[PDB]
Design a protein around this motif. Structure first.
Motif, PDB file in Angstrom:
ATOM      1  N   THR A   3       0.833  -1.194   0.000  1.00  0.00           N
ATOM      2  CA  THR A   3       0.000   0.000   0.000  1.00  0.00           C
ATOM      3  C   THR A   3       0.873   1.251   0.000  1.00  0.00           C
ATOM      4  O   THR A   3       1.891   1.308   0.698  1.00  0.00           O
ATOM      5  N   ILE A   4       0.485   2.234  -0.810  1.00  0.00           N
ATOM      6  CA  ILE A   4       1.206   3.500  -0.862  1.00  0.00           C
ATOM      7  C   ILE A   4       0.393   4.583  -0.161  1.00  0.00           C
ATOM      8  O   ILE A   4      -0.831   4.665  -0.287  1.00  0.00           O
ATOM      9  N   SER A   5       1.091   5.430   0.591  1.00  0.00           N
ATOM     10  CA  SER A   5       0.470   6.504   1.347  1.00  0.00           C
ATOM     11  C   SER A   5      -0.091   7.559   0.402  1.00  0.00           C
ATOM     12  O   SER A   5       0.486   7.858  -0.647  1.00  0.00           O
ATOM     13  N   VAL A   6      -1.236   8.120   0.791  1.00  0.00           N
ATOM     14  CA  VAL A   6      -1.896   9.125  -0.030  1.00  0.00           C
ATOM     15  C   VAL A   6      -1.088  10.416  -0.011  1.00  0.00           C
ATOM     16  O   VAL A   6      -0.591  10.849   1.036  1.00  0.00           O
ATOM     17  N   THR A   7      -0.945  11.032  -1.180  1.00  0.00           N
ATOM     18  CA  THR A   7      -0.211  12.285  -1.340  1.00  0.00           C
ATOM     19  C   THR A   7      -1.236  13.415  -1.373  1.00  0.00           C
ATOM     20  O   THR A   7      -1.946  13.601  -2.362  1.00  0.00           O
ATOM     21  N   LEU A   8      -1.311  14.167  -0.275  1.00  0.00           N
ATOM     22  CA  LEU A   8      -2.236  15.289  -0.178  1.00  0.00           C
ATOM     23  C   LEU A   8      -1.909  16.345  -1.225  1.00  0.00           C
ATOM     24  O   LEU A   8      -0.817  16.922  -1.216  1.00  0.00           O
ATOM     25  N   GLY A   9      -2.849  16.601  -2.132  1.00  0.00           N
ATOM     26  CA  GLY A   9      -2.621  17.542  -3.210  1.00  0.00           C
ATOM     27  C   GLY A   9      -2.902  18.982  -2.834  1.00  0.00           C
ATOM     28  O   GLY A   9      -3.461  19.738  -3.635  1.00  0.00           O
ATOM     29  N   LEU A  10      -2.527  19.373  -1.617  1.00  0.00           N
ATOM     30  CA  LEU A  10      -2.704  20.750  -1.172  1.00  0.00           C
ATOM     31  C   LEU A  10      -1.840  21.677  -2.017  1.00  0.00           C
ATOM     32  O   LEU A  10      -0.608  21.640  -1.929  1.00  0.00           O
ATOM     33  N   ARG A  11      -2.439  22.598  -2.662  1.00  0.00           N
ATOM     34  CA  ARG A  11      -1.887  23.585  -3.579  1.00  0.00           C
ATOM     35  C   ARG A  11      -1.979  24.997  -3.017  1.00  0.00           C
ATOM     36  O   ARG A  11      -0.947  25.638  -2.801  1.00  0.00           O
ATOM     37  N   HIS A  12      -3.194  25.469  -2.723  1.00  0.00           N
ATOM     38  CA  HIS A  12      -3.435  26.838  -2.281  1.00  0.00           C
ATOM     39  C   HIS A  12      -2.578  27.820  -3.067  1.00  0.00           C
ATOM     40  O   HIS A  12      -2.661  27.879  -4.297  1.00  0.00           O
ATOM     41  N   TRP A  13      -1.742  28.579  -2.355  1.00  0.00           N
ATOM     42  CA  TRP A  13      -0.731  29.439  -2.968  1.00  0.00           C
ATOM     43  C   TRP A  13      -1.343  30.378  -4.003  1.00  0.00           C
ATOM     44  O   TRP A  13      -0.761  30.641  -5.058  1.00  0.00           O
ATOM     45  N   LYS A  14      -2.536  30.889  -3.701  1.00  0.00           N
ATOM     46  CA  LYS A  14      -3.146  31.897  -4.555  1.00  0.00           C
ATOM     47  C   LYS A  14      -2.411  33.228  -4.491  1.00  0.00           C
ATOM     48  O   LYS A  14      -2.688  34.108  -5.313  1.00  0.00           O
ATOM     49  N   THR A  15      -1.497  33.386  -3.539  1.00  0.00           N
ATOM     50  CA  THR A  15      -0.715  34.609  -3.323  1.00  0.00           C
ATOM     51  C   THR A  15      -1.719  35.734  -3.037  1.00  0.00           C
ATOM     52  O   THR A  15      -2.852  35.473  -2.617  1.00  0.00           O
ATOM     53  N   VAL A  16      -1.329  36.990  -3.255  1.00  0.00           N
ATOM     54  CA  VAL A  16      -2.198  38.125  -2.976  1.00  0.00           C
ATOM     55  C   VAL A  16      -1.615  39.337  -3.685  1.00  0.00           C
ATOM     56  O   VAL A  16      -0.399  39.442  -3.865  1.00  0.00           O
ATOM     57  N   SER A  17      -2.421  40.215  -4.464  1.00  0.00           N
ATOM     58  CA  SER A  17      -1.923  41.445  -5.076  1.00  0.00           C
ATOM     59  C   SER A  17      -1.457  42.422  -3.993  1.00  0.00           C
ATOM     60  O   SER A  17      -1.898  43.568  -3.905  1.00  0.00           O
ATOM     61  N   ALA A  18      -0.547  41.933  -3.148  1.00  0.00           N
ATOM     62  CA  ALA A  18       0.037  42.782  -2.115  1.00  0.00           C
ATOM     63  C   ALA A  18       0.835  43.919  -2.732  1.00  0.00           C
ATOM     64  O   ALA A  18       0.783  45.058  -2.253  1.00  0.00           O
ATOM     65  N   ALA A  19       1.579  43.631  -3.789  1.00  0.00           N
ATOM     66  CA  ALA A  19       2.318  44.668  -4.488  1.00  0.00           C
ATOM     67  C   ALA A  19       1.346  45.547  -5.266  1.00  0.00           C
ATOM     68  O   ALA A  19       0.607  45.036  -6.115  1.00  0.00           O
ATOM     69  N   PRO A  20       1.304  46.848  -5.007  1.00  0.00           N
ATOM     70  CA  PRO A  20       0.405  47.729  -5.748  1.00  0.00           C
ATOM     71  C   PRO A  20       0.868  47.894  -7.183  1.00  0.00           C
ATOM     72  O   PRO A  20       2.028  47.591  -7.501  1.00  0.00           O
ATOM     73  N   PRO A  21      -0.019  48.359  -8.089  1.00  0.00           N
ATOM     74  CA  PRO A  21       0.325  48.417  -9.521  1.00  0.00           C
ATOM     75  C   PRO A  21       1.660  49.081  -9.832  1.00  0.00           C
ATOM     76  O   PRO A  21       2.553  48.435 -10.389  1.00  0.00           O
ATOM     77  N   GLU A  22       1.820  50.358  -9.489  1.00  0.00           N
ATOM     78  CA  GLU A  22       3.138  50.976  -9.537  1.00  0.00           C
ATOM     79  C   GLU A  22       3.777  51.088  -8.159  1.00  0.00           C
ATOM     80  O   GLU A  22       4.814  50.467  -7.909  1.00  0.00           O
ATOM     81  N   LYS A  23       3.173  51.860  -7.261  1.00  0.00           N
ATOM     82  CA  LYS A  23       3.413  51.814  -5.829  1.00  0.00           C
ATOM     83  C   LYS A  23       2.078  52.049  -5.134  1.00  0.00           C
ATOM     84  O   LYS A  23       1.912  51.727  -3.954  1.00  0.00           O
ATOM     85  N   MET A  24       1.113  52.592  -5.890  1.00  0.00           N
ATOM     86  CA  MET A  24      -0.222  52.924  -5.319  1.00  0.00           C
ATOM     87  C   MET A  24      -0.020  53.529  -3.927  1.00  0.00           C
ATOM     88  O   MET A  24      -0.688  53.084  -2.974  1.00  0.00           O
ATOM     89  N   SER A  25       0.887  54.502  -3.819  1.00  0.00           N
ATOM     90  CA  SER A  25       1.098  55.158  -2.531  1.00  0.00           C
ATOM     91  C   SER A  25       0.161  56.359  -2.399  1.00  0.00           C
ATOM     92  O   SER A  25       0.573  57.497  -2.185  1.00  0.00           O
ATOM     93  N   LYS A  26      -1.134  56.078  -2.541  1.00  0.00           N
ATOM     94  CA  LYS A  26      -2.143  57.134  -2.539  1.00  0.00           C
ATOM     95  C   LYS A  26      -3.448  56.544  -2.010  1.00  0.00           C
ATOM     96  O   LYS A  26      -4.132  55.803  -2.720  1.00  0.00           O
ATOM     97  N   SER A  27      -3.771  56.869  -0.761  1.00  0.00           N
ATOM     98  CA  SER A  27      -5.084  56.604  -0.172  1.00  0.00           C
ATOM     99  C   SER A  27      -5.478  57.889   0.548  1.00  0.00           C
ATOM    100  O   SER A  27      -5.185  58.065   1.733  1.00  0.00           O
ATOM    101  N   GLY A  28      -6.140  58.788  -0.175  1.00  0.00           N
ATOM    102  CA  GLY A  28      -6.401  60.136   0.297  1.00  0.00           C
ATOM    103  C   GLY A  28      -7.794  60.260   0.894  1.00  0.00           C
ATOM    104  O   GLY A  28      -8.794  59.994   0.224  1.00  0.00           O
ATOM    105  N   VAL A  29      -7.835  60.668   2.161  1.00  0.00           N
ATOM    106  CA  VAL A  29      -9.069  60.982   2.869  1.00  0.00           C
ATOM    107  C   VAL A  29      -8.789  62.190   3.756  1.00  0.00           C
ATOM    108  O   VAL A  29      -7.653  62.438   4.165  1.00  0.00           O
TER     109      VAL A  29
END
Lengths: 51, 51
Positions: A3-29
């Motif tokens: 018998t061979i052990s099951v290999t969990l196909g956990l992928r996830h790793w969707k990452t995140v648009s953490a890096a803004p387009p250019e720097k997007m250093s603008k949130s003005g309020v």
């Protein structure tokens, strides 16, 4: 075969648009709620022309 | 604030050895306040709507 052990196909790793387009250093309020410590009123300005 | 006779007599020196107030003493007053506030999170940003 044996018998061979099951290999969990956990992928996830969707990452995140953490890096803004250019720097997007603008949130003005702006300050809205008339600051705090709203201070005094008209403080009786009046006029000083010698009537 | 009204201070104490022990403080006013320990401010001056003249204390004997290992009495703590052998040298003249100096005092300061500090005041700390704890307050509430509101934080708004929207459009990937934070700020104080009330300021």
């Amino acid at each position: 075969n044996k018998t061979i052990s099951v290999t969990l196909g956990l992928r996830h790793w969707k990452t995140v648009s953490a890096a803004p387009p250019e720097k997007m250093s603008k949130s003005g309020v702006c300050k809205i709620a008339t600051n705090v410590y709203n201070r005094d009123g008209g403080a009786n300005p009046f006029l000083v022309k010698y009537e | 604030v009204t201070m104490s006779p022990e403080s006013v007599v320990a401010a001056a020196g003249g204390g004997n050895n290992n009495s703590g107030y052998n040298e003249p003493q100096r005092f300061a007053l500090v005041v700390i306040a704890v307050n509430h506030n509101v934080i708004r999170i929207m459009n990937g940003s934070m700020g104080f709507p009330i300021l």
